[PDB]
From a paper:
The V-Csn structure was solved in two crystal forms; apo1 containing a single molecule in the asymmetric unit, and apo2 containing a dimer in the asymmetric unit. The apo2 crystal form was solved by molecular replacement using the refined apo1 structure as the search model, and refined with phenix.refine. The apo2 structure has two independent V-Csn molecules in the asymmetric unit and the two molecules form a non-crystallographic dimer. Superposition of the two molecules of the apo2 dimer onto the apo1 structure gives a root-mean-squared deviation (RMSD) of 0.45 Å for both molecules. In the apo1 crystal form, the same dimer is observed albeit generated by the crystallographic symmetry of the C2 space group. This is consistent with the observation that V-Csn exists as a dimer in solution based on size exclusion chromatography, although there is no evidence that dimerization is required for enzyme activity. Formation of the dimer buries 1830 Å2 (∼9%) of the surface per monomer. The regions of contact involve the loop between β-strands β4 and β5 (in Domain-2) in one molecule slotting between helices α3 and α4 in the second molecule, linked via hydrogen bonding and hydrophobic interactions with residues from the two helices and strand β8.
Residue numbers in the entry:
A (entry chain A), B (entry chain B): 2 to 224
Write the structure that this text describes.
């Protein structure tokens, strides 16, 4: 077999794929990561996700995004997409923008991105590209490794990636627990922030060199 | 008396203001410029503005945004805010993104920006900052010179700037022709693209040095 187990998370095996470019693959469900969307979090459950999923916004521990000097979530400004909403962070970021800016983070609503579990990146660096495939519908999309999830879970990506895969994109009730999504990651492919046009083109180039979606469909029968 | 006429458009006198930092001021209505908003234009009147307001989207003269090699408007991709909508352009732009990207242009929905009439920039360069004041309500906001309008009209700005001034922000039916908006432009203040946090902070410093909003309110009685 061209596939060799390199890792396993929550019952999902991750396989190294023989050949160039270097890649690994796994079949999992698809939870919705709204992190980075500028409407994900707001006071009093005003966002698309529950405020409490970012922590305590009243001077306790807030982990959902950047905080001020007193530990309160940053509120978006009049020049930000959703004034008064909190700034939701992703692990991948655009260095052009300050820590307190929604523009620093990857907008889950518009950018197809995958989540990898913490300590299970398997050599991938934030910004690396991937091909993502819904085996139930045939839908597929290129994506970046854009966020880090719990080390104990696997199979998660952005609101826009869900839309592209025809998976329910609602942050509260969406996603699927059915293991219908095949993710092919290209570790070492980018490793930095770049424009979506640039990384999408690169994902296309790597996928063609790797053997295309047709090869992924063939390999997916082993998963 | 601190004001000296430097220009006139559509019956609106534009005045330089004595002292540093250099500035000019005018009192005008506020038309809505949806250019740069990624939902402004789409085929078949799908955008927030009428498609015809961008020109001819059937291979003819299209001024609404970039076109392909055949002359038809560029459509947004799966990694753009509104896939399938046209790319709407502003005169001011972010050089980090390609001509065909909505991210290159100033998103009217989120960025407070003013329009100056073509051939009537009066020394201002795109990216320069301004203080904008609704004399009827007292609302005010800093903004950038973001787009170029018809040479025969004056008083126009972005959807977000309308929101900040509590003026109807609808691209089709909004804005006002009542001369209630006082715009104080700082020519030579920035003259390039930079993050909103940077230019907004600089506008705040220039306004402090210039004498604050209270000075603009007093000067507005001469307009």
């Amino acid at each position: 077999s061209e596939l060799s187990e390199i890792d396993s998370v929550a019952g999902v095996t991750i396989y190294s794929v023989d050949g160039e470019p270097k890649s690994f693959v796994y079949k999992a469900g698809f939870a919705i990561d709204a992190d980075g969307a500028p409407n994900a979090y707001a006071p009093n459950n005003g966002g698309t996700d529950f405020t409490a999923n970012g922590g305590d916004d009243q001077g306790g521990d807030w982990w959902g995004g950047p905080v001020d000097a007193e530990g309160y979530p940053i509120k978006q400004k009049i020049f930000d997409p959703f004034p008064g909403y909190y700034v939701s962070a992703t692990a991948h970021f655009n260095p052009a923008y300050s820590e307190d800016s929604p523009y620093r983070y990857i907008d889950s609503n518009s950018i197809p991105f995958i989540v990898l579990p913490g300590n299970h990146s398997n050599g991938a660096k934030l910004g690396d590209v991937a091909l993502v495939y819904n085996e139930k519908t045939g839908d597929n999309c290129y994506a970046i490794y854009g966020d880090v999830g719990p080390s104990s879970k696997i199979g998660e990506g952005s609101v826009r990636l869900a839309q592209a895969l025809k998976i329910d994109d609602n942050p509260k009730a969406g996603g699927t627990e059915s293991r219908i999504v095949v993710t092919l990651v290209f570790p070492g492919s980018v490793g930095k922030w770049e424009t979506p046009k640039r990384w999408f083109s690169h994902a296309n180039q790597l996928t063609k060199a790797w053997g295309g979606l047709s090869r992924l469909k063939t390999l997916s029968d082993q998963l």
